[PDB]
Ligand binder design. Structure first.
Ligand SMILES: [Mg+2]
Ligand SMILES: [Mg+2]
Lengths: 90, 95
DNA sequence: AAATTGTTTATAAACAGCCCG
DNA sequence: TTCGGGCTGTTTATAAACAAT
């Protein structure tokens, strides 16, 4: 059943999302979108606060490092270079 | 006796730093907090103790350590982040 | 065995600062 | 251009499920 809650922690799903990109970085919006796209539970069932929980995990875990672009500013979430196992959803 | 305006992380540091050796068992941390902030002795719901344990495990600044003799488990504070918080630092002189 | 201690994840909220229409 | 509200980031608290001692 494609829309039941996945057996992955927010921390796992955030990694899957970031590791799906060639540059191994992703904006917060794109992380919401990636998770919604891949785990429809979050697009159709989860209460609004799941997004609060994503942001909480981003700040909580030192493996998720924020990088602001050379512009001043656009900001991406990355995985610490020494942390990345390159866990992709496949 | 109102709930004091300090975080669990702050109060845990007060407790640990009150000892000679800058180390304290969990049960002594409970007792210390109860004795100095009676909100937790008399009013707080029982889950406050859960929150203490959560804090000790969550924050890397809190480092569990067995005595050299192996028998007691102590909580201590990490050297790369000991700002040395003690209760006495929280007191305003009266104006 | 039973209770205490220790770890991790989830959820909620307060709040600051930034962004943007 | 300012204004105000929504978005993003950080932090603290509470509960729970659970493992380990
Ligand atoms: Mg982080
Ligand atoms: Mg700890």
């Amino acid at each position: 059943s494609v829309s039941e809650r996945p057996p992955y922690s927010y921390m796992a799903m955030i990694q899957f999302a970031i590791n799906s990109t060639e540059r191994k970085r992703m904006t917060l919006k794109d992380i919401y979108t990636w998770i919604e796209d891949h785990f429809p539970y979050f697009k159709h069932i989860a209460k609004p606060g799941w997004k609060n929980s994503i942001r909480h995990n981003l700040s909580l875990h030192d493996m998720f490092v924020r990088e602001t672009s050379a512009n001043g500013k656009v900001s991406f979430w990355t995985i610490h270079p020494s942390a990345n196992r390159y866990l992709t959803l496949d």
